[PDB]
Design a protein around this ligand. Structure first.
Ligand code: NI
Ligand code: NI
Ligand SMILES: [Zn+2]
Ligand SMILES: [Zn+2]
Ligand SMILES: [Zn+2]
Length: 110
């Protein structure tokens, strides 16, 4: 991706990863779209991206939850900043998604 912001003012809208973790195989909760899905890092709803039916950007506006994670490449987008963001706050969510997607953590045990 492009060089992300190292921080943004919306990182408080990043909540703990739920007990069930981040399952990258979930389709869009609104249209059932199978690919290009994103997960909201506030409420962990799974909705399609801008290349599908724009359900995540709609949710982001209606809820005021601006920080979302991509199932396709595990990048994190902020709607309020209109930018990719990378910060330690996002480490847990990126690792949880990587664990389901690739069967191991970002830094596996030796
Ligand atoms: Ni990092
Ligand atoms: Ni990896
Ligand atoms: Zn949300
Ligand atoms: Zn959708
Ligand atoms: Zn932001």
């Amino acid at each position: 991706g492009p060089d992300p912001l190292p921080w943004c003012p919306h990182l408080e809208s990043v909540r703990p990863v739920p007990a069930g973790g981040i399952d990258v195989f979930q389709p869009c909760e609104e249209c059932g779209g199978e690919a290009e899905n994103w997960i909201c890092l506030f409420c962990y709803k799974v909705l399609c991206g801008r290349y599908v039916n724009q359900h995540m950007v709609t949710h982001g506006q209606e809820s005021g939850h601006p920080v979302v994670l991509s199932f396709a490449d595990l990048s994190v987008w902020c709607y309020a900043c209109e930018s990719y963001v990378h910060n330690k706050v996002l480490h847990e969510a990126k690792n949880a998604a990587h664990l389901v997607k690739f069967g191991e953590g970002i830094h596996p045990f030796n």
